[PDB]
């Protein structure tokens, strides 16, 4: 007689399920562990098409490997959410999750039951969030100096040689520029443009936007100072009714009369544009060739078929209103830019709209000698934008270099004393797990992690220094705050909560049923 | 139990990743190395269609072979950016990059950590940019004597037999002609035409453009001197309204009335063109057969369906504006050319527009006995256009023959002296890598590189001659600057920065993960 | 082009090598773990021929599986040596080894160096051997009461339903009978015979041997009491010279003369045999049909073509000399037995030689209702023979139920206190490893291992009872010695030494290179 | 593992490159040589 469950399926039960998930978990974490910290190393990933990524970026590495294993996929989500919510610490969150799994294994191997480790882990994680709040330092949303340390620290995570002050300062300026009325930071308002050049150091902030267009007619000016900018959502073409209409001509002289009426409509449209005071125009749709001439005659710069996202960012940066009826355009809808110029950048003709006074969107123009060099600089800039953004929004930071993890572990071990029975083992395991961060930072730096940890713990003990950690450079336990190695509270709260919730989910599993 | 990482994957870790990337790098550099300098040799590349490229051009070689290795691709980017930013030195940039990887291996082998190597490379490179600025010689953007030396030097890189004075002077004229208002050179403004002929020496500069078109009517003049040129992007055909319109005829008499209105409309367009004073007309689109007759009656030479990019180059060279409505055509929209002539070249009839007064676009008409001979001449012209452009824009040149690399190398060793720790080893390594240029120049010349190096070094020592290099023709060490062997500063700055940045990126890699 | 190491080869390095070895070991151990102790369960193994094995026997399970994994094979050697040296505790030895590897992982995952783990493991192993000597109790080789407990405990390891006093006593009698004149036990001297019957309880000890033979002629007695046994390894056939000899007959009268001669010497061999006083005969070679008759006439029981093996057991059993020259047969070569009988057993005709007075070999005749039921009873008999034999040879025993492991583990932690530095971690890990035994006993008994262990340790703490263990049959912590749960010291010394040596070997591996 | 330059490629270097080019040229020339001048002979080519 036939089998109930499909004969085309692999199944793993009890200890086998647990080992499968735990192992898949640990292995995923191990792949990114060697990237961690300023002394970490990079991966080169090559896809089936032969395209290559080289990067220190945790979540990028994990996405680009084509990981199939179901449990591994559950940990990759930890990295994706870290990137979305914070923009930095993707490796950290994943490595913590893998270590929570490793630490749980030791407990299951001693007959501690899964629901008990889940329970302890949940209590530990909650305690950790409370401890994090007390540990965190308040900072002002407009403390340029601290935000710059936040940016430098982030970039350094991808290597000391990336952390140029000028770059950190540029990033802080970019993010501060787009903070909205509610004090919120929308990362998308910072346009990232990537162009080969003489050097990574040519990277610059443009207060404005880069539009991949040329002016529609060579007769128009190619450089305009103090431009007055019109933004049109409608085509500068002959308008037609929605209701089907046809012209009937029975008198040979009407040909010219109609042709001359359509020409006049275009001349009128151009007239209205001129009247607003606009000397630069971006149209989201088509501009009739004939109108192209009239604009040129008037000395008005125009680009046509501008991307909707371009129009939207122009508006944000220049302060113009995208107008849908040429008739309705007025002086009040115009934006301002100190400079509008068409010029070539690494061989490509583009229109720069720059030197805007209070742009709500700006552009990081990232330069470097090669495409692949630029990509990684762009990834670093992104990490920095994320954490500067977090610090502006939250006004809360912690010390880095694994100082905070050490402080947490110590405190959690104190907490665990007060826990009765078996759950205590789980809480203690969760505490021990956090130390994978300082431990890995040390090993990637070529240091002895055990002795390093002994020293860092000692500096935290007996009401010591919550900011003490190992400076991977000097090799000494130092005050990370004094050294300016700092990171948003959010990096830690998100990473730890994600690691906890995802491992709790995985540790509840006693049966894996895989089809096909 | 299932695999965590995809099983379809090849992986190389630690020493193997480093070896892979270093070796692939080195091998890519070694392929173009024998092309380096005036005594370098050429490659013949045959693709899968049997098409043939023969060239001394580094980036061309590297593009044309179909390299798939991931680390080699990173190094090819170096050649591509060199071509884009400078136009010359593509081989130099790749060879330095290869040598940087080679010197890094020696340090990795005697147990220096990668981040220290990158730290050292970055410091040396930064210092080298600073030194390059003081080594450079100031030069005037209108000093044609120096620009001609720049161009001669460039062409000689591809073989002295290519370096003719007439050719180099022509190139200087071409580039001088298109310098814009900001003092920038867009090398796309110099159109390259390639046409077989009696000799390479028949290559000529046309102050104007070639149009692959014939006049639309044989009744039109084949030749106009002191041409007045109309540029129309609108068809010279009966204009249709945008709104759908049909003629209705009820009276037989009206049949002719409309037909003859359409002819009058045509005559009018032609009269207006004539009225501007135009005797030559390029139209981007169609011209009614009847209009073609009228034009020919009026003595006006016309070509139809002209490529938009042709229209554009025409406007740049003659001064005309491209007009959208024949109604607006005035005398001020007209371009000038000393000669417009339809004639045969290499069996093809084309329209020459020559002897323009202040052309903003011009045309190098490259001749030679065969197609493949011409191709390489055009490549050499491109190198020279590139470096003449840089010189005009930058006003900074250095001496060639590897003299500048020797000077740099010597100064970096001094700098290295004051560096503390392992980092010093990397700085010295970078210094030494630069000498791959003078060493390879001497190799390809059949000279003893080691002895040559001793000599050139001695000539730079004791505050000697920063311009001393080995002249591959003399066999002697001489002042290269006095010999007129010079190249733009930008050649060296772009090549060293790109080599530095790409190799630093490659050296960070400890893990290669290649799918499929 | 081309590769140094073979292209057809898998390789695992550093952490991957350690992981695959550690995992393979752990999984091998987990396979037999559930069999451990009196509450352990059994495996049914089926081979590729569809033959089945049902057993609780650790080493049998590991041999019958077709393990190919290289590290796993290393651990199976542990079970084989345990079987060879001791005959019991094969599961115990593998489970300790598996746990040593698990414990080692956690050390490796803190970055303790393999050699330090190895050094710690060796130090703990040597200390354990010293502690075992003092922990052990002395017993006399003639203490049947203790030997019976050793036997009962052993059989109980395979389930309480197997552990019958009568059977244990038989086994003690069997081993006692074969102890040699130096106090050594050769388990080979206890012939195992397996025959289906009415009940497992019908198992019996035969003071003598079973011969799978029938007497050569039905005319011979079927039964003889107080038999005088001759043992010949020469054929009772006509003797032929070693030099090629041929009879030549020329006189018809001589035909019968040579025939009559042959039978007369046959008749004389038989008279030589009778003369010795033998009435029972076992011949290794053939017995001429005619001599068969003669033996029959003289009333002598004989069997022919007896295999060397039985001849040798017969000699040991009855004290006869296997003789090679019929002429040399004297009455002092004859063995004795109370009863020689040809008898059917389970439908099989066999010669029982029993009730010998001081047999140097004896026969365990194992009975049971089915072949597979019998096979496992024989395996349990083999365990018991093994440990009774060890106890007789060593005169040292320890208490069972995991009591000795707990005592050992407690003393080793004390020892670890005085170890400086990192090695201390390893010594502690080794100590903790030994508790896998009491832990697994409890697990399989369905008890809570964590609390059980807390209790047993407390019973061992500060001058406690070294014999304190959990009794799986009562659920309480009791004095295992006073309950009679005891096992030879050698079980523990071999198990721990094997586990330590094999895992130290595996832990030194950092590179797996596998062909094909 | 793996190769930098494509695995599907022939390559001829130094004297081998010069030889194959020189030979190919010479053979091409020898093909039409016998046609040269008023006493030259003709080819029949079939596609
Ligand atoms: N100067 C320093 N000394 C010690 N630790 C540092 C220093 N600078 C940064 N770090 C730490 O390095 C860690 C970040 O490294 P990084 O490789 O970027 O991990 P990540 O942010 O978790 N992953 P990713 O999303 O790829 O950037 C943080 O723990 C930092 O605190
Ligand atoms: N007369 C000379 N004597 C010695 N060296 C020279 C002389 N003329 C040019 N050179 C050098 O030869 C090098 C250029 O040769 P070349 O083969 O073109 O290399 P490249 O410019 O780096 N590659 P490519 O992009 O293909 O042109 C430069 O280093 C020049 O300084
Ligand atoms: N009454 C008992 N209470 C607690 N433990 C017991 C008792 N009787 C026996 N044991 C233990 O059970 C263990 C032996 O069980 P067993 O399953 O035979 O393992 P093994 O000897 O290592 N493997 P094998 O070679 O297959 O017999 C020993 O530790 C005994 O001390
Ligand atoms: Mg980071
Ligand atoms: Mg990132
Ligand atoms: Mg060159
Ligand atoms: Mg070139
Ligand atoms: Mg046993
Ligand atoms: Mg056994």
XYZ file of C-alpha atoms in Angstrom, chain A residues 60-299:
240
model
C 25.960 42.123 0.029
C 28.149 39.035 0.361
C 25.234 37.055 1.724
C 22.848 38.146 -1.061
C 25.325 37.461 -3.801
C 26.119 33.937 -2.729
C 23.191 31.965 -3.984
C 22.371 30.318 -0.671
C 19.708 27.627 -0.914
C 19.763 26.009 2.529
C 16.446 26.848 4.264
C 17.951 27.621 7.693
C 20.745 29.680 6.194
C 18.081 31.740 4.337
C 16.470 32.472 7.735
C 19.756 34.020 8.922
C 20.246 36.013 5.750
C 17.006 37.838 6.649
C 18.728 39.095 9.783
C 21.281 40.787 7.550
C 18.652 42.241 5.201
C 16.641 43.786 8.053
C 19.799 45.199 9.584
C 20.522 46.939 6.272
C 16.980 48.275 5.897
C 16.526 49.533 9.474
C 20.051 50.798 10.209
C 22.231 50.556 7.119
C 25.213 49.198 9.032
C 26.182 46.250 11.252
C 24.914 43.575 8.828
C 27.828 41.249 9.597
C 27.565 41.893 13.323
C 23.906 40.832 13.488
C 24.531 37.626 11.504
C 27.620 36.699 13.525
C 25.700 37.187 16.779
C 22.897 34.964 15.455
C 25.354 32.181 14.465
C 26.960 32.340 17.898
C 23.583 32.164 19.662
C 23.044 28.959 17.660
C 26.492 27.639 18.529
C 25.885 28.392 22.213
C 22.451 26.805 22.126
C 23.949 23.569 20.737
C 26.086 23.097 23.839
C 22.896 23.378 25.899
C 20.838 20.929 23.825
C 23.776 18.504 24.096
C 23.269 18.617 27.848
C 19.595 17.789 27.681
C 18.372 21.352 28.124
C 15.021 21.480 26.324
C 14.470 23.878 23.370
C 11.555 25.768 24.929
C 13.800 26.508 27.883
C 16.642 27.907 25.812
C 14.129 29.936 23.795
C 12.739 31.311 27.072
C 16.144 32.230 28.500
C 17.208 33.772 25.196
C 14.054 35.886 25.198
C 14.634 37.087 28.743
C 18.291 37.779 28.006
C 17.394 39.739 24.855
C 14.845 41.841 26.683
C 17.280 42.539 29.517
C 19.847 43.470 26.859
C 17.539 46.082 25.343
C 17.000 47.609 28.807
C 20.757 47.558 29.492
C 21.431 49.155 26.109
C 19.217 52.104 26.974
C 21.186 52.896 30.131
C 24.518 52.412 28.322
C 23.657 54.820 25.471
C 24.853 58.449 25.378
C 22.665 61.312 24.192
C 23.897 63.496 21.355
C 22.466 66.429 19.426
C 21.041 65.988 15.929
C 23.281 68.851 14.835
C 26.485 67.902 16.612
C 28.698 67.971 13.508
C 31.688 66.623 15.390
C 29.972 63.540 16.781
C 28.165 62.817 13.511
C 31.539 62.995 11.783
C 32.960 60.450 14.246
C 29.918 58.313 13.537
C 30.628 58.532 9.800
C 34.381 57.914 10.176
C 33.749 54.914 12.436
C 31.342 53.388 9.915
C 33.711 53.822 6.965
C 36.608 52.437 9.017
C 34.554 49.276 9.477
C 35.370 48.700 5.812
C 39.085 49.555 6.275
C 41.183 52.405 7.718
C 42.311 53.405 4.234
C 38.706 54.287 3.344
C 38.174 56.658 6.274
C 39.202 60.074 4.985
C 37.952 62.953 7.132
C 36.945 64.950 4.064
C 34.700 62.098 2.971
C 33.107 61.690 6.415
C 32.471 65.448 6.560
C 30.917 65.398 3.068
C 28.601 62.592 4.165
C 27.561 64.422 7.312
C 26.809 67.507 5.205
C 24.779 65.464 2.693
C 22.607 63.812 5.348
C 22.086 67.025 7.410
C 20.895 68.668 4.200
C 17.948 66.300 3.682
C 16.640 66.063 7.255
C 12.912 66.857 7.003
C 10.425 68.877 9.101
C 9.939 65.954 11.474
C 13.700 65.515 11.972
C 13.551 62.344 9.829
C 16.160 61.170 7.323
C 15.129 59.539 4.048
C 18.243 57.885 2.650
C 16.821 58.085 -0.896
C 17.045 61.863 -0.918
C 20.802 61.377 -1.196
C 21.429 60.522 -4.830
C 24.474 58.373 -5.433
C 26.231 59.029 -8.715
C 29.258 56.923 -9.689
C 31.859 58.173 -12.158
C 35.427 57.108 -12.905
C 38.049 59.767 -12.390
C 41.529 60.658 -11.193
C 41.024 59.447 -7.659
C 38.671 58.304 -4.897
C 39.541 61.658 -3.263
C 37.689 63.548 -6.041
C 34.403 62.343 -4.522
C 32.271 65.433 -3.920
C 28.912 66.601 -2.604
C 26.707 68.436 -5.049
C 23.993 70.636 -3.557
C 21.650 69.741 -6.390
C 21.267 66.950 -8.920
C 22.853 65.362 -11.950
C 20.553 64.787 -14.863
C 21.663 62.361 -17.576
C 20.502 64.618 -20.434
C 21.865 67.160 -22.871
C 20.014 70.369 -23.665
C 17.589 69.770 -26.491
C 19.195 72.273 -28.865
C 22.840 73.253 -29.321
C 21.710 76.839 -29.772
C 20.723 77.125 -26.089
C 23.245 78.356 -23.494
C 25.218 75.508 -21.945
C 25.974 77.375 -18.733
C 23.521 79.452 -16.725
C 24.298 81.174 -13.442
C 21.485 81.913 -10.979
C 19.133 79.903 -13.148
C 15.380 80.203 -12.766
C 14.066 76.700 -13.276
C 10.666 75.603 -14.607
C 9.554 71.985 -14.090
C 6.848 70.725 -16.476
C 4.976 67.429 -16.228
C 3.185 67.978 -19.520
C 4.549 67.860 -23.068
C 5.392 71.077 -24.861
C 3.605 69.708 -27.935
C 0.362 70.462 -29.776
C -2.486 69.767 -27.379
C -5.278 67.454 -28.508
C -8.727 66.825 -27.039
C -9.488 63.525 -25.288
C -12.683 63.379 -27.343
C -11.832 62.150 -30.887
C -11.662 65.134 -33.243
C -11.005 65.524 -36.951
C -10.362 68.584 -39.107
C -12.253 68.721 -42.399
C -10.832 70.965 -45.099
C -12.772 71.892 -48.235
C -11.014 75.159 -48.982
C -7.321 74.946 -50.105
C -6.492 78.090 -48.119
C -7.419 76.413 -44.805
C -4.393 74.112 -44.991
C -2.061 76.981 -44.154
C -4.532 78.434 -41.646
C -4.569 75.271 -39.544
C -0.831 74.676 -39.892
C -0.313 78.267 -38.782
C -2.643 77.771 -35.830
C -0.707 74.794 -34.531
C 2.511 76.798 -34.907
C 0.962 79.662 -32.913
C -0.058 77.342 -30.089
C 3.580 76.301 -29.710
C 4.733 79.922 -29.838
C 2.174 80.770 -27.142
C 3.322 77.906 -24.922
C 6.895 79.119 -25.225
C 5.644 82.665 -24.568
C 3.994 81.626 -21.332
C 7.202 79.845 -20.253
C 9.284 82.977 -20.915
C 6.790 85.138 -19.000
C 7.371 83.206 -15.772
C 11.013 84.307 -15.855
C 12.343 80.767 -16.392
C 15.660 80.535 -18.211
C 15.983 76.792 -17.609
C 13.323 74.151 -18.137
C 13.068 70.415 -17.533
C 10.107 68.785 -19.295
C 9.112 65.288 -18.187
C 7.782 64.499 -21.663
C 8.275 65.542 -25.257
C 9.092 69.002 -26.519
C 8.034 69.586 -30.098
C 11.029 70.197 -32.389
C 9.448 73.506 -33.335
C 9.070 74.602 -29.684
C 12.690 73.539 -29.250
C 13.575 76.301 -31.691
C 11.472 78.986 -29.981
C 12.957 78.214 -26.551
C 16.403 78.461 -28.139
C 15.497 81.789 -29.752
C 14.497 83.014 -26.295
C 17.745 81.850 -24.738
